[PDB]
Amino acid sequence: VLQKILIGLILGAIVGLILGHYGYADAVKTYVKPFGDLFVRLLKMLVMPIVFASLVVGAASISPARLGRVGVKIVVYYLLTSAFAVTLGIIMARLFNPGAGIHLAVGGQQFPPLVKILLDIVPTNPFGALANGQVLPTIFFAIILGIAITYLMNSENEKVRKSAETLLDAINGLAEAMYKIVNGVMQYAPIGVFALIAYCMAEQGVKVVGELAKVTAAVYVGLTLQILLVYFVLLKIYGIDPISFIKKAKDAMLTAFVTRSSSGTLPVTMRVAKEMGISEGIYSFTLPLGATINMDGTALYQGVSTFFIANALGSHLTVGQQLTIVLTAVLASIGTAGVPGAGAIMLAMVLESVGLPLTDPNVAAAYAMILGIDCILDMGRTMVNVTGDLTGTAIVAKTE
Amino acid sequence: VLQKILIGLILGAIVGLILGHYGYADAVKTYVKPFGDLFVRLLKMLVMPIVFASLVVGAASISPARLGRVGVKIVVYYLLTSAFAVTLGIIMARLFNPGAGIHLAVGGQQFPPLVKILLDIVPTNPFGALANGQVLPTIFFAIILGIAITYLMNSENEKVRKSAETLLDAINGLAEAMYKIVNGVMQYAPIGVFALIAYCMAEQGVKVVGELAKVTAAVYVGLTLQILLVYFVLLKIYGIDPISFIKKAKDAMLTAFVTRSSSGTLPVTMRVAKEMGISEGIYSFTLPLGATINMDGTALYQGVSTFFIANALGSHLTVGQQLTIVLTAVLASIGTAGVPGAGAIMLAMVLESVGLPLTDPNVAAAYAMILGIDCILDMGRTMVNVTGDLTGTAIVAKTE
Amino acid sequence: VLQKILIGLILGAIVGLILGHYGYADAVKTYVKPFGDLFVRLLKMLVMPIVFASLVVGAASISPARLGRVGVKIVVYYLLTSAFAVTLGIIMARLFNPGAGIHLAVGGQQFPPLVKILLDIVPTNPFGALANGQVLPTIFFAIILGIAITYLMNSENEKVRKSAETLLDAINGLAEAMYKIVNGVMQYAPIGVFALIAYCMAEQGVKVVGELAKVTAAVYVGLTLQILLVYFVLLKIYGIDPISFIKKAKDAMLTAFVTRSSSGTLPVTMRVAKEMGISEGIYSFTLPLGATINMDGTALYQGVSTFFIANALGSHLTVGQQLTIVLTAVLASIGTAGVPGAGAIMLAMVLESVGLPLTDPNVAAAYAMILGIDCILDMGRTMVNVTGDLTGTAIVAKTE
């Protein structure tokens, strides 16, 4: 009966698109949107406990072989599927030509060392990192905690074996409880989906016209091809049924699509991975990493929009400019956060790499138009972002 | 032997009232007051762990019937006992006439959407909400966690039943430990009560004179009538012996009276509810909620002081304005936090409701005079605030 | 094979001292130093969980006798060994005369009630204190929690005994797991030691010359005499073989020396105390306390530098001023935090005690010179600070 999410999604996208066409976006923002916001509030509630607990228990696996190999593989999957998404976005923005009318405007006025990021992946107080919603530091600590718990259960002493067993059970009992709540809040998901889709359709409905229609088309048709030409093809190569994969991932896909936060849909994403029969050692490490590392819809978006500005500015991006886009957009997609709208902010990075700084007021003009339709683009962008998460999660799972 | 709190309270209110009448409030603030502050520090120490643990364990009950019915009942009790307390304060401030001398002054210069409060009751990181002292968000998460733990203990699998039992046991052992510390710090309570009663008596002793004596009298007599005509009567109606109820609640009453923080006296309040034989499913959820939601002494205070200001300005508050006072003071008593002094700040809200803004310097004169005696009033105010918590807690407990 | 820390330390101090003598301190700060920083990041990661868990489990001991006696003894040991370290620094700074050349400079421009510290040792939300890295408040709460758990295990009811045993096991399983991680990160310690020692050798290598060489010499020779004439002698008096004690504490000593943070080396310090056969009731409470309370190398440093400044200004510190130096530097060493550089900051306190404020630009000249060589001093300073922790920890352990 949970397929009523589509019922809540489809006709919900209509009632908002109607009211917004009569100056009722304020009525949606005052009555309808709070319900969909509450849905996101409930989803964010479960992220930190379900990620920490499942990954401590998920570290009940061969630490050198399993964790090391699933890591060094999924990072190569993530890097390859993101480098292919930005090239596909380039190809889309090359077949298409979103920037046609050179529209100048005035008053745009837009706008972290690597060692300072890597050294912060290792926390200095996991109680704070858990209390501050830092997923990568708590992934690191929970990996080390579960491995230490496993080493405790293999000693000759029974007291330390009994204590480690008592700790790991309570942590698993927490994880199981968090998954049951995921099912509970996913039962309310059709209402929250209906509300969040009435908004962003009553607000950013009529805006998408002209050259904005081309860039939205170029992204979405490239996003579907990313699902088909990459995920579907690579799933069949490793012998994973694509139709059944999508039939299960409908929940996490649409939840990411409507919420636009890959970190907010991670509880649903983790539960779907449990539903398809994936080892906890796999999805509890692969998915929270890919939530902030694997952004395929972002790199495609970023590769399309980076042509739209230059195409609307007359700038001719040579093959070298396209390759620097491919490289820089991958790096920007890694840094892009699992929160709604972040990809538009880090899109500046690839714009700077091609000698198109946001300082130029003419560049800031087109940038303001993209942020005016980001809500639409971000929905499908996050969906493919999480779809690639579950794809490589299942691929590396069935690789072991 | 713990009744020496009264011994520490009574003669402690004298030694401060004596020393304060000879310019020794600095000696109390430098030597005596730190002991009562440490008492509050120990009480605040236990609030977050004892509330989270006891309510997770308290969620080992029929979730639809028990929790739903105890909720929809205690919220109506809270709304009715607060709406009666503000009317009783109005009746007191009408029998009395605190504002007689129109005293003008110079240099007063005094001085959250509902959806932003309701949507904030649902946390987004329970690790942080526990680390930030947010009782309403941790109440919500602990309800859902215990229900999920109960649903885990009813599955056919033994592993998830063992893990859920392991988790719920450690949480209960934490709650039990917190209650034992409550008894330990309650043994030191007579000293902290003696110290906190030397202060506010050495500081705010002779201050209460004239119109200040009238408004303080009208408040306390309404608070006693609220205790007698409401709590005692409704206790007897539901077959609860009032005298034995007071014999149980003596600890939480004097602690709330002395501490003035309903959230700081909540550990003592929770222990008293256990001692009088209440199930955790009832009191462990009702009390922390009512600590911040149910404030009857606040609504009575606010209903009395809002008359004193208008009476000291000559403005005639019509019967319609008196009804808006009843409504707004209830809302302000709901929003008032369980920390000392919040009710005087939330009095501004009902003052705005009657067209008496704090911007007007004549309004700021009487407002600053009320804040100059708030300490004394706040003591009895918090006492009735927690008394109404324990009253309805026992009523709805014996209703099941 | 872990003795390769010395291999990483010794020749590591050379490769930095070489590269730093050719303008390659930036190459060390950009490539070498991040490795030693990561080592400190991993060490800080374990401090809060291993201290809370081990001390809750360590509270499984006779609370009045054991904890009370180990406390009232180790606080007297700490006060005596710190009062002797500052006198030894005075004797060193009197045998030596670091301040010889009165060097005036321009542009120095340098630069908490006791009740507010004591009352802050008692937390008001242990979830926050754990999430904020506050070791003294979590020490207090963990003492009270473990004692309450012990009182729970001695009741006639079996349910509360089972829950308390379930809680204490999971906490012990956490402590054991943290100790296993301490061994894991201590295996990486030789690399982090090699990186942190190449730094402050490439940075502060040639700097120590002249009066800087004299004050640094006076500090270290007093630190060694503090180790020999105090620790070694008092160990032998209480029947502890000094050579075997060093063979155990070699890890914590070199880690403290290299990290300069007594709180960052506390996990290694706690593990060494376990390896040398100390009950958790003693060391797990004594060590985290002494980490921030017992700093003998700090008081010696402060006693030496306070002479160097006055000697570089010509002011004659009388015997009475020398006694106030002893007292205030002990207080400054008590208040000094377990983070690198705090002792130089707390040196201002004893400088104010002798009428030598940092406001005087001539005082700020010598002060800036001491802060220009504080890094090396701090290395040996922290080493003796933690050495005195483990010394008295073992003494009071074998006293029970």
Ligand SMILES: N[C@@H](CC(=O)O)C(=O)O
């Ligand atoms: N919505 C994306 C971020 C973005 O595309 O800006 C995510 O949460 O992963």
Ligand SMILES: N[C@@H](CC(=O)O)C(=O)O
């Ligand atoms: N002292 C009250 C608040 C107030 O009266 O301002 C309470 O904590 O409930």
Ligand SMILES: N[C@@H](CC(=O)O)C(=O)O
């Ligand atoms: N490094 C010392 C502080 C100092 O000497 O400044 C410590 O952490 O204990």
Ligand code: NA
């Ligand atoms: Na993602």
Ligand code: NA
């Ligand atoms: Na990303």
Ligand code: NA
């Ligand atoms: Na309130």
Ligand code: NA
């Ligand atoms: Na209350």
Ligand code: NA
């Ligand atoms: Na100190």
Ligand code: NA
């Ligand atoms: Na120390």
